[PDB]
Scaffold this active site. Structure first.
Site, PDB file in Angstrom:
ATOM      1  N   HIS A   1       6.528 -45.635  51.660  1.00 60.37           N
ATOM      2  CA  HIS A   1       7.353 -44.288  51.755  1.00 60.37           C
ATOM      3  C   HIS A   1       6.479 -42.950  51.872  1.00 60.37           C
ATOM      4  O   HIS A   1       6.683 -42.378  52.635  1.00 60.37           O
ATOM      5  CB  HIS A   1       8.424 -44.240  50.635  1.00 60.37           C
ATOM      6  N   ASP A   2       5.554 -42.852  51.054  1.00 62.77           N
ATOM      7  CA  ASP A   2       4.558 -42.029  51.029  1.00 62.77           C
ATOM      8  C   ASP A   2       3.813 -42.039  52.334  1.00 62.77           C
ATOM      9  O   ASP A   2       3.856 -41.107  53.162  1.00 62.77           O
ATOM     10  CB  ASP A   2       3.363 -42.124  50.128  1.00 62.77           C
TER      11      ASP A   2
ATOM     12  N   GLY B   1       6.656 -41.517  42.542  1.00 66.75           N
ATOM     13  CA  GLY B   1       6.159 -40.525  42.074  1.00 66.75           C
ATOM     14  C   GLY B   1       5.202 -39.344  42.900  1.00 66.75           C
ATOM     15  O   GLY B   1       5.078 -39.723  43.955  1.00 66.75           O
TER      16      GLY B   1
ATOM     17  N   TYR C   1      19.340 -35.279  56.771  1.00 69.71           N
ATOM     18  CA  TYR C   1      20.055 -35.914  58.214  1.00 69.71           C
ATOM     19  C   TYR C   1      21.512 -36.358  57.772  1.00 69.71           C
ATOM     20  O   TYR C   1      22.043 -35.977  56.753  1.00 69.71           O
ATOM     21  CB  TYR C   1      18.952 -37.214  58.328  1.00 69.71           C
TER      22      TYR C   1
ATOM     23  N   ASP D   1      13.476 -43.071  54.355  1.00 70.86           N
ATOM     24  CA  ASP D   1      14.350 -43.114  53.043  1.00 70.86           C
ATOM     25  C   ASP D   1      15.406 -44.709  53.061  1.00 70.86           C
ATOM     26  O   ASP D   1      15.153 -45.198  52.097  1.00 70.86           O
ATOM     27  CB  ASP D   1      15.304 -42.023  53.091  1.00 70.86           C
TER      28      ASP D   1
ATOM     29  N   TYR E   1       2.411 -45.403  43.087  1.00 70.50           N
ATOM     30  CA  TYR E   1       3.014 -44.343  44.156  1.00 70.50           C
ATOM     31  C   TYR E   1       4.351 -43.740  43.998  1.00 70.50           C
ATOM     32  O   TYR E   1       4.717 -42.898  44.713  1.00 70.50           O
ATOM     33  CB  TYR E   1       2.786 -45.394  45.471  1.00 70.50           C
TER      34      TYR E   1
ATOM     35  N   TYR F   1       6.270 -40.853  54.989  1.00 70.13           N
ATOM     36  CA  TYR F   1       6.513 -39.498  54.980  1.00 70.13           C
ATOM     37  C   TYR F   1       5.001 -38.793  55.735  1.00 70.13           C
ATOM     38  O   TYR F   1       5.242 -37.689  56.479  1.00 70.13           O
ATOM     39  CB  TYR F   1       6.634 -38.925  53.686  1.00 70.13           C
TER      40      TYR F   1
ATOM     41  N   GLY G   1       2.508 -37.498  45.032  1.00 70.45           N
ATOM     42  CA  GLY G   1       1.216 -38.343  45.495  1.00 70.45           C
ATOM     43  C   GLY G   1       0.953 -39.821  45.244  1.00 70.45           C
ATOM     44  O   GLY G   1       2.167 -40.672  45.271  1.00 70.45           O
TER      45      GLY G   1
END
Ligand code: BER
Ligand code: CA
Ligand code: CA
Length: 124
Positions: free
Chosen positions: A48-49, A30, A73, A99, A28, A52, A32
């Site tokens: 995190h993916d 990287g 931000y 993040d 994960y 997002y 996709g």
């Protein structure tokens, strides 16, 4: 935004080179992802993916070129601590928190050298 995430990681892990350490790690970390994460670090990356993917599914937020990485931000680093600025708008705050949680996760997951540049087509 992407550059700030790299620097959030350096905040949380002072001896890290984010791009060298956490890019193309596991299944994960990287671009996709596929299959099931291979360890906790890899699993920080999927979350995190996923984090997002939820921000993009927020009707209120229309990120440039549909990528939350473009959205800057405000945050700060002190003595290992990341603080997402309260004055961030709801969409910037969502991304900031993706993040930050990820940088804090990375800092606690075992780093297994062997999962770096994994054969994803095989193992993911
Ligand atoms: C947006 O175009 C880009 C540009 C750059 C990208 C570089 C990274 N990703 C895709 C990118 C991408 O795709 C969406 C995804 C995850 C990731 C984790 C990382 C990292 C870099 C990246 O270093 C720290 O750990
Ligand atoms: Ca990914
Ligand atoms: Ca912004």
């Amino acid at each position: 935004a992407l550059w700030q995430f790299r620097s959030m990681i350096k905040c949380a892990i002072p001896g890290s080179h984010p791009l060298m350490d956490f890019n193309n790690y596991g299944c994960y970390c990287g671009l996709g992802g596929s299959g099931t994460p291979v360890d906790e670090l890899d699993r920080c990356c999927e979350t995190h993916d996923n984090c997002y993917r939820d921000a993009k599914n927020l009707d209120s937020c229309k990120f440039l070129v549909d990528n939350p990485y473009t959205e800057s931000y405000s945050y700060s680093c002190s003595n290992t601590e990341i603080t997402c600025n309260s004055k961030n708008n709801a969409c910037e705050a969502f991304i900031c928190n993706c993040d930050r949680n990820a940088a804090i996760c990375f800092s606690k997951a075992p780093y297994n050298k062997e999962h770096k540049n994994l054969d994803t087509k095989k193992y993911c």
